[PDB]
Amino acid sequence: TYQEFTNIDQAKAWGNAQYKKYGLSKSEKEAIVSYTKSASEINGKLRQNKGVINGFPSNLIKQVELLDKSFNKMKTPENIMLFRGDDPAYLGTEFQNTLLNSNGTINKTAFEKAKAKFLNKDRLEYGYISTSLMNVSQFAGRPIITKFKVAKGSKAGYIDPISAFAGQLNMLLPRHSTYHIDDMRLSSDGKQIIITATMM
């Protein structure tokens, strides 16, 4: 049983309540703000290097170590569900230019091939995972929506107050996370794939 927030006021109150007691240091807050501005670049470098940071520039090694350390203070007090939007390349190079029909809907054949590739499989992410407490506007245009089931006691932080995209109920999960794909379905209007996954 995982808490899915369905009310914006409820989600914001819960998020603010967690943030109030983290006690993040000045340098930790600075590292997080900076991450939200350059997330795709940082996560891309982590993926290219399979999580090995020893050869990174000195500034970036420092930042990654601060982000990692930040999670010693940020844990969820209950089973929760988190949301994220992704573009077609998330499924592989063979889906980048095939997933979408010209009219914006998901191509049905490509959907079936993506389901065969990923359903009931584990996936390892070398980057951090930026998410939200709800299905928010910052990724309404994205063709893939993932709902992550995160267990009580797991590392997870409400970072909305120290995010460049404040107002979007922003949450962060740690790098090198693994999750199991439980379900993949087409939305009722055929414009998105909805994925359900359980975090390990």
Residue 76 is part of a domain; what is its CATH number? Answer: 3.90.176.10
The Cα 198–Cα 103 span in angstroms is 32
The Cα 144–Cα 10 span in angstroms is 25
Bridge-based pairing of strands 144-150 and 80-86 is: antiparallel
For this experimental structure, what is the resolution in angstroms?
A: 1.6
**C-alpha of 17 from chain center:** 21
Residue type at 159 in one-letter notation: I
CB atoms within 10 A of CB 110: 19
Experimental technique used? X-ray
Query: Residue 50 belongs to what domain range?
Result: 1-200
CB 161 within 8 A of CB 70: no
- Name the CA radius of gyration of the chain, rounded: 17
Bridge-based pairing of strands 177-186 and 122-125 is: antiparallel
The Cα 100–Cα 103 span in angstroms is 8
- What is the total count of domains within the chain? 1
CB 186 within 8 A of CB 163: no
